[PDB]
Scaffold this active site. Structure first.
Site, short mmCIF file in Angstrom:
data_model
loop_
_atom_site.label_atom_id
_atom_site.label_comp_id
_atom_site.label_asym_id
_atom_site.label_seq_id
_atom_site.Cartn_x
_atom_site.Cartn_y
_atom_site.Cartn_z
N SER A 162 0.98 -1.35 0.24
CA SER A 162 0.04 0.04 0.15
C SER A 162 1.09 1.31 0.34
CB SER A 162 -0.87 -0.12 0.99
OG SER A 162 -0.75 0.43 2.42
N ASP A 210 -0.63 -0.92 -4.35
CA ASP A 210 -2.64 -1.21 -3.52
C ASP A 210 -2.66 0.43 -3.66
OD1 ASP A 210 -4.75 -2.98 -3.07
OD2 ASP A 210 -3.94 -2.25 -0.87
N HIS A 211 -4.08 0.55 -3.28
CA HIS A 211 -5.06 1.25 -3.83
C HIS A 211 -3.69 3.11 -4.00
CE1 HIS A 211 -8.63 -0.24 -2.29
NE2 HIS A 211 -7.65 -0.09 -1.11
N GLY A 263 -11.49 -5.91 1.40
CA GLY A 263 -11.63 -6.24 2.16
C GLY A 263 -12.20 -7.94 2.57
N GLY A 264 -10.78 -8.41 2.47
CA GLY A 264 -11.08 -9.87 2.45
C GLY A 264 -10.88 -10.29 3.94
N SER A 265 -10.01 -9.81 4.41
CA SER A 265 -10.22 -9.94 5.78
C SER A 265 -12.01 -10.40 6.97
CB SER A 265 -9.46 -9.38 6.88
OG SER A 265 -8.20 -9.65 6.30
N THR A 272 -5.49 -7.41 7.42
CA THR A 272 -6.36 -7.50 8.54
C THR A 272 -5.91 -8.43 9.42
OG1 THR A 272 -7.80 -5.58 7.96
CG2 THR A 272 -8.59 -6.52 10.81
NA NA Z 1 -12.61 -6.38 6.26
ZN LIG Z 2 -8.45 -2.24 -0.62
#
Ligand code: NA
Ligand SMILES: [Zn+2]
Ligand code: NA
Ligand code: NA
Ligand code: NA
Ligand SMILES: [Zn+2]
Ligand SMILES: [Zn+2]
Ligand SMILES: [Zn+2]
Ligand SMILES: [Zn+2]
Ligand SMILES: [Zn+2]
Ligand SMILES: [Zn+2]
Ligand SMILES: [Zn+2]
EC number: 4.1.2.13
Lengths: 328, 328, 328, 328
Positions: free
Chosen positions: B52, B94-95, B235-237, B259
């Site tokens: 990131s 990332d982003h 937001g996989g976590s 996360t």
């Molecule tokens: Na998440």
């Molecule tokens: Zn993301």
């Protein structure tokens, strides 16, 4: 920037000429490398970053456990970072005994010889051969051939005569070293002699170093106050001021630091875990607090604390404010 | 090894064809990179390591705080390590929002274009342009020119339409994306669409992804069950199994993990500090215990724990045992 | 105030009549006694404070380790404190097996008999004889003579038939109990029957209690819905709501609480130590912080937390707001 | 046993005669009382247990917060415990200023006067009147009437002239004290004079005490080396050996200990919480470990540690091995 071989030789020559030394900080990671270079930069100092056999193995990760891989990976990282700082940073490998030469120092020398053959500079600027567990003659036979290889790759060799703990180096030991290796004209080397020095913070005889210089000066036909050897002080962490000062006067140009910077790095991490206990742990059915279990949150504190300790080392060894880039 | 552009494209194509995905693990350091690659290797899986903007800044150290420097330094480290593993590891950024393009993605693209011009492969294999804060047309105008630059450097572009937290993507949004960028023939891209997904572990509508695929298929004159988009799940976590399974069915090929791996990395460090409290701290006039304040002691536990969590991700996303190197 | 024998009998009779129960809180110290009474008072409830053999030994201090001494010392403390609260507090001793009767229950009964002989009230208002490790007939022979001694000292006896963990009580076991002891006319007693109940928080059959009441009612020539027994529920901590409700319906008047109040007492102490780690420990040559190593600082938090848990118990057992002093 | 008034007077007279002193340990609970008495017993020493205004309030619990209640409750507990030890334990109340006399010392004196009137001994054996915040004449007027009440209840009064921190006592201050109160013939009293002494561990002038003794001796027509005053040393914790020795020579018979025993009590509790962090907290969905969140587990360690510190105090003050019960 990374120290070129020319700059590194000049660093050590200036240190010796002016009775100061550089801290050589053991690093194991991107964070510890970053902390060390920031420490040198904050102190306006040049400095040395070193990887031990164990540090290199750790650097390579649990899935690899290969000293060459870890050293190369961390060296490549350090090359990128050091280019962004206005001090000179030299890369060094720490204690390599006989049975690890073929799996650490020799392959690394070979990598640097390849770079040099293509018109480049070596990946590391010094390597340590630790022959303190073998008889002096065997030690110096290996040192002589390694010095030739090292000098050809524009690399300084560090050697050790006698054993670091955790009997002293005799005049004949010092004599044999000058006889086998010369006084720099066959390639620069650094000498770790044993004068009651030990790894880890818990009977130093710095006069052994004064004796070595006098013995070497007599051998070489030099004045009595000459200092032909560039010495390395092993077990730097936890040393008295008066003992450091004496060591500097006798030609110590490099002092190894590990224990003290380890404590400095870990101390705020411990503090972080305790004061954020219910954020770094999922307690009583709660889900913790991402902002404090994010590794950056405590690793930035670790980095800053380690850098402060490196600044202290630069002031203790009197290399603070003396970077050869002269940014003032 | 590091994934070549050819291998990476094949990874994503195979994932899509077979309804599995790769975890893309946010890393910030030598330790976290090592943990991630070891996790992929333990799961017999290929994988993605991503930096990131904040991770890159952290990687560059407190004395530099430069995203390009940190990303390059960590990428160079990762290149050395990944060569020692029998799985393919792709590097991703990332982003990156509009006002950071000139200080992150664009300079990195330029570095890779230089490598490619000399007959080499790019340093990173994908870059994310996050245009979710700007209007769709502006987003896609930037995406179109970045896709051209990226494809010319053998790099896959990730884009985002709509906002990740911590309203949904419309059929017209999906339509505009196909119209502006095609379906891979002008360069491969990955699409993060917004379907109620959020950063951090504390109302998902995966059907939005099914709708996007159908809308794209109709636009392209393809059968109703075609999946023209390669989706990314942000937001996989902390996601449910049933929600992940549905996402995979609709063409998610990459699921971002941060996360959950952060918690896994930190958890044994916390445990270490508490159980060794009188070793990591100098208490009651004592000097602590070097063997437990040595950063390696707890960072090896952190690495192992993070690797275990990455293995879990590979099993959850069904890429475990499917590395394109076919080491079985 | 401390419950007089008359008030205590009325407490239990009212609980039974109205299908509620009192928590009986295991205490070991001035702090835990204070927390328990404050909990009862905050809930507008009467309550029971009990000392186990181990609790009494702990109360007597490491230099004494005498159960009678600890129980008397803590009882004398509790008498002074309870006089300042507008709820009734009964004092009870917990599990005393056969080989401890001569060193716990019997000497305590003797102390109370002496008080009663002088026109006073007993020091404790109930004592437990735990004969669950001996055959039923032997259990009840001891119970019969202890009940006579207890009733003569104005004390209620608790007995146990069958074993609490950490096979069920048969109809004949219940039958023998009524036959040997009557139904209160020879002195009030409380009955702990075993219906799958266990000490500590990690297969309950409350219907065993319903069966016991029916078996006793038939023996006594009473209506089918009569509840001749006053039951005690051992292993109260960690129980389901539906299981507690059922137990209450079948005549449980006392539920033992220990594990849950221990956790409540300790939890803020742990939190205190962690967040004040550098105040409760002398770290890095510093001298700590007296305001946080003063035991009162964390013990007041422990007291308040334990009291909150006792309030919860009073609401779960439905004795909250029902103190026989009727302070509203 | 609890010290009778006769034994207590003999304790102090013997201490003075032989130039030793007793530690007076601030206690707040059953645990701290138990630790203190065990410490005295382990050192073969008599000793003093004292309750401060704040300690008494804490002893009464959060639901009461009444100094008399807490002092009486803890005194009643201590009476039971001390009967089981072969050393003499005196009970004392610490600093009571003017505006608390009517809510602490006076009601307690009244309780003891009632006991004495019935042929019993007083509940406490000494009480402190701390008049150091008021002018000397007012201080001594209150002291005179309190001494009369105290002596009539067989109680020793402690008074303070000048202020303890956290200017010195003049010869006239010492003179006024002898004039108003005599030298014991109107009732025994203990004198806290101010000679640069402070509460809490972070410029002592013990010669002020020598001066007071000489001033009093001259007033009384006694030899120059006479010591008419029995002195109390406030702020005992953290004092130098040489300073303690001097104080003893000048007639200190009682040294107050609080800070040092607080640290000793808390230190193993902290250690317990840290090393059992995942047992005293419910972490990661687990339910903790009852054996380590049971308060007895860490409070027994606290008790033992505090007792060790009390033994040290007895050896520092030279009362160790000198109990008037002569158990050897
Ligand atoms: Na998440
Ligand atoms: Zn993301
Ligand atoms: Na050392
Ligand atoms: Na239970
Ligand atoms: Na003090
Ligand atoms: Zn060394
Ligand atoms: Zn300069
Ligand atoms: Zn295969
Ligand atoms: Zn029980
Ligand atoms: Zn009412
Ligand atoms: Zn004081
Ligand atoms: Zn004796």
């Amino acid at each position: 920037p990374i120290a070129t071989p020319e700059v590194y030789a000049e660093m050590l020559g200036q240190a010796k000429q002016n009775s100061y030394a550089f801290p050589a900080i053991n690093c194991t990671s991107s964070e510890t490398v970053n902390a060390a270079i920031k420490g040198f930069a904050d102190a306006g100092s040049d400095g040395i970053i070193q990887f031990s056999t164990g540090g290199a193995e750790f650097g390579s990760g649990l899935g690899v456990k290969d000293m060459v891989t870890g050293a190369v990976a961390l060296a490549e990282f350090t090359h990128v970072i050091a280019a962004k700082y206005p001090v000179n940073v030299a890369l060094h490998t720490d204690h390599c005994p006989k049975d690890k030469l073929d799996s650490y120092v020799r392959p690394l020398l070979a990598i640097s010889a390849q770079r040099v053959s293509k018109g480049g500079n070596p990946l590391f600027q010094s390597h340590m051969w630790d022959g303190s567990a073998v008889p002096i003659d065997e030690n110096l036979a290996i040192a002589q051939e390694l010095l030739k290889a090292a000098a050809a790759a524009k690399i300084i060799l560090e050697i050790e005569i006698g054993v670091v703990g955790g009997l002293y180096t005799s005049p004949e030991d010092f004599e044999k070293t000058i006889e086998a290796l010369g006084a720099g004209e066959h390639g620069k080397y650094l000498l770790a002699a044993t004068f009651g020095n030990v790894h880890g913070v818990y009977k130093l005889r710095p006069d052994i170093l004064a004796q070595g210089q006098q013995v070497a000066a007599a051998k070489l036909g030099l004045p009595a106050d000459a200092k032909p050897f560039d010495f390395v002080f092993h077990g730097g962490s936890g040393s008295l001021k008066s003992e450091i000062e004496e060591a500097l006067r006798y030609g110590v140009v490099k002092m190894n630091v590990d224990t003290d910077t380890q404590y400095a790095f870990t101390r705020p991490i411990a503090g972080h875990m305790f004061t954020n206990y219910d954020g770094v742990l999922k307690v009583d059915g709660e889900v913790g607090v991402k902002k404090v279990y994010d590794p950056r949150s405590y690793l930035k504190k670790a980095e800053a604390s380690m850098s402060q300790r490196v600044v202290q080392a630069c002031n203790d060894l009197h290399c603070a404010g003396k970077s050869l880039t002269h940014h003032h």
